[PDB]
Amino acid sequence: TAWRAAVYDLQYILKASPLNFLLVFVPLGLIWGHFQLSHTLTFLFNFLAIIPLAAILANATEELADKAGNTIGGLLNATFGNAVELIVSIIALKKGQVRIVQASMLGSLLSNLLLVLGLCFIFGGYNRVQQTFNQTAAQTMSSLLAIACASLLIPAAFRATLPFIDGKILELSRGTSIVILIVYVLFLYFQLGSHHALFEQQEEETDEVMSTISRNPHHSLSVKSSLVILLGTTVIISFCADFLVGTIDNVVESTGLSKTFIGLIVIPIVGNAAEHVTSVLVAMKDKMDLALGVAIGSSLQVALFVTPFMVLVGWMIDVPMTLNFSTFETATLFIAVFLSNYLILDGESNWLEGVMSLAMYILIAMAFFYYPDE
Ligand SMILES: CCCCCCCC/C=C/CCCCCCCC(=O)OC[C@H](O)CO
Ligand SMILES: CCCCCCCC/C=C/CCCCCCCC(=O)OC[C@H](O)CO
Ligand SMILES: CCCCCCCC/C=C/CCCCCCCC(=O)OC[C@H](O)CO
Ligand SMILES: CCCCCCCC/C=C\CCCCCCCC(=O)OC[C@H](O)CO
Ligand SMILES: CCCCCCCC/C=C\CCCCCCCC(=O)OC[C@H](O)CO
Ligand SMILES: [Ca+2]
Ligand SMILES: [Ca+2]
Ligand SMILES: [Ca+2]
Ligand SMILES: [Ca+2]
Ligand SMILES: [Ca+2]
Ligand SMILES: [Mn+2]
Ligand SMILES: [Mn+2]
Numbered sequence: 001t002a003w004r005a006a007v008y009d010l011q012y013i014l015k016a017s018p019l020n021f022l023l024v025f026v027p028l029g030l031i032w033g034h035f036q037l038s039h040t041l042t043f044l045f046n047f048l049a050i051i052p053l054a055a056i057l058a059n060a061t062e063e064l065a066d067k068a069g070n071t072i073g074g075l076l077n078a079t080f081g082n083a084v085e086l087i088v089s090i091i092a093l094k095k096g097q098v099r100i101v102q103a104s105m106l107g108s109l110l111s112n113l114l115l116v117l118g119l120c121f122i123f124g125g126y127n128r129v130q131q132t133f134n135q136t137a138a139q140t141m142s143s144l145l146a147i148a149c150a151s152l153l154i155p156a157a158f159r160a161t162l163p164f165i166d167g168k169i170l171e172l173s174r175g176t177s178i179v180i181l182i183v184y185v186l187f188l189y190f191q192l193g194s195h196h197a198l199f200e201q202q203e204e205e206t207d208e209v210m211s212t213i214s215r216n217p218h219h220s221l222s223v224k225s226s227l228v229i230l231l232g233t234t235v236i237i238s239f240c241a242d243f244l245v246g247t248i249d250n251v252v253e254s255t256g257l258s259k260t261f262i263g264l265i266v267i268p269i270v271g272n273a274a275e276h277v278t279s280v281l282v283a284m285k286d287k288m289d290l291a292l293g294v295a296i297g298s299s300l301q302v303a304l305f306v307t308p309f310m311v312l313v314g315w316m317i318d319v320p321m322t323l324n325f326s327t328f329e330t331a332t333l334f335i336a337v338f339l340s341n342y343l344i345l346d347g348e349s350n351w352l353e354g355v356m357s358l359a360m361y362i363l364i365a366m367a368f369f370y371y372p373d374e
Contacts, residue, residue: 009225013063015216017055018277025049026236033243039250046240047270053237054084055274060229063221074192078184078305083234084271085306088241093310093319095245101321103263105307106329109149111268112299113333113340114361116276120291121354124283134347136289137202141296142344144187148303149337151180156325173322174315177308184304206282206290213281244270258373260326265365272298292344328371332364 014020029049032042061080065073079086085108089101124131133139155172191199211218221229252259257266275294283291307323314321325333339360343353 006225009219009221010229012216012219012221013056013059013229016059016210016214017052018214018274018281019055020052022048022052026053026240029240029243033240033246039247040254042243043247043251046244047266049240050084050088050237050244050270051273053233053240054271055278057083057230057233057237058274060221060226060233064223064226064230066220067223070192070196074188078188078301080230080234082271082301082306084237084241085302086309087234087238088245088267088270089306089310090313091238091241091245092248093314093321094317096319097245097248097259098314098319098321099259100245100248100263100267101310102323102325103260103329104267105302105310106325106333107264107268108272108302108306109299109333110264110336110361110364111272111276112295112302113336114357114364116272116279116295117292117340117343118354118356118358118361119276119280120283120288120295121349121357122351123280123354124286124288124291125349125351125354128286128351130348130350131283131286131288132348133289133292133344136293137198138289138292138296139344139347140198141293141300142341145296145299145303146337146341148180148183148300149333151176151183152303152307152323153325153330153333155323156327156330159324160327160330169324170320170322173311173324176323177311180304180308181312184308187300187304202290202293205287206294209282209285209287209290210278213285252373257369258371260329260371260373261365261368264329264368288349296344326371328367332368336364 014023025045025048029042029046032038032045036042057080061076061083064080065076068076085104089104092100092104121131155169155176158172159169207218248259248262251257252262275298279291279294282288282294311321311323339357343349343357
């Protein structure tokens, strides 16, 4: 049984993962990257390969964190819950790709604020008059997110509004990151302590809806079974991430796309696509609050943990990772933050709110497509 039960446990993980059909790009990604066949396809194949792995790793992390206990479980979600964003950004930092990391962090927020928002409102609202989410955990978390993004943008808004200064921007970003990371710890105490019931119920509800859609009885993987998949999926992602990051300069050169565009629009898809599909499917079950909850939760991690931690990592390995986003990026994120929060606060969405949000994201991507590289 110890062999055949391990097989079923693997089946349970794959069947709980939305876009598992893209796993076919894992060997292709590995082949192309290792043999260094063609840069553009090496980018694309690994790009496609990490997407299902993120979901696989997420379900492994979640299954492990459940039996890990309160304190440790939260640390696992801080770590392996953000692994894709973490791994890719760390590898990118180790190759001096500061702009890529900066754009990917902000882009991840943009995608969660506008893109998945639009998709959820469209797919959930096309066959309904409206969808309500008043007085839900989604609105609560949304308020926190509004402050989180604003805080993260402060050093950027600072440099943008300036009338030597190089070392001070670095010092400000690093001091800011310490503060935000203190907040993140308190956010964990909020999440796992005083308001544990709020997040727990939202998590259980989301799992229940996902089990309904995925159509497989909830099976709790053993610590051993989940830890293998966890460390297994992680090393594969690392390989694919390394290949993907190693081709950035070439893809930038072969195509006409800037590092900013690739970082802001392309890269975030990697760690969000699986979660986005999840959010959409839940929204179609007329449970927008849960759908929004997933997207808002991921944004909180990027804003409160991943982004400031990356500047800390940069400090450790002597790469000048900063919160010094471009002026347009700064302005854009502020726009997205206002609107998303306004839309989430109005309490009722429709399919048109989704069309327009989606259109705006496209318009932003279109604008960033014209953003100058030199
Ligand atoms: C579900 C998984 C099923 C997987 C089924 C895969 C079957 C083929 C496997 C080949 C692995 C080795 C591939 C080797 C490819 C080498 C590429 C090549 O040789 O190109 C070099 C290039 O010419 C430099 O200039
Ligand atoms: C109420 C007003 C309070 C603010 C008043 C201004 C305070 C200025 C100092 C920053 C404190 C931030 C605490 C964390 C400081 C770490 C910053 C740091 O160490 O920077 C070194 C730099 O990284 C080397 O390159
Ligand atoms: C039964 C009640 C009556 C039926 C209700 C029908 C609902 C309408 C659905 C719209 C799908 C969304 C349309 C596709 C999304 C367009 C987004 C957009 O902005 O597209 C820009 C364009 O792609 C740039 O070239
Ligand atoms: C580190 C991640 C490895 C991912 C593996 C994906 C599947 C590769 C299949 C066969 C391994 C080939 C072993 C090495 C033998 C081929 C020689 C090789 O290294 O080719 C690369 C080329 O030299 C460039 O400089
Ligand atoms: C629930 C009632 C119906 C039951 C049957 C369900 C049928 C689902 C139909 C279409 C799902 C469309 C999902 C669209 C998700 C697209 C999101 C995406 O793939 O990625 C977004 C972005 O590009 C990454 O950052
Ligand atoms: Ca769970
Ligand atoms: Ca409960
Ligand atoms: Ca879950
Ligand atoms: Ca996430
Ligand atoms: Ca209202
Ligand atoms: Mn249902
Ligand atoms: Mn609305």
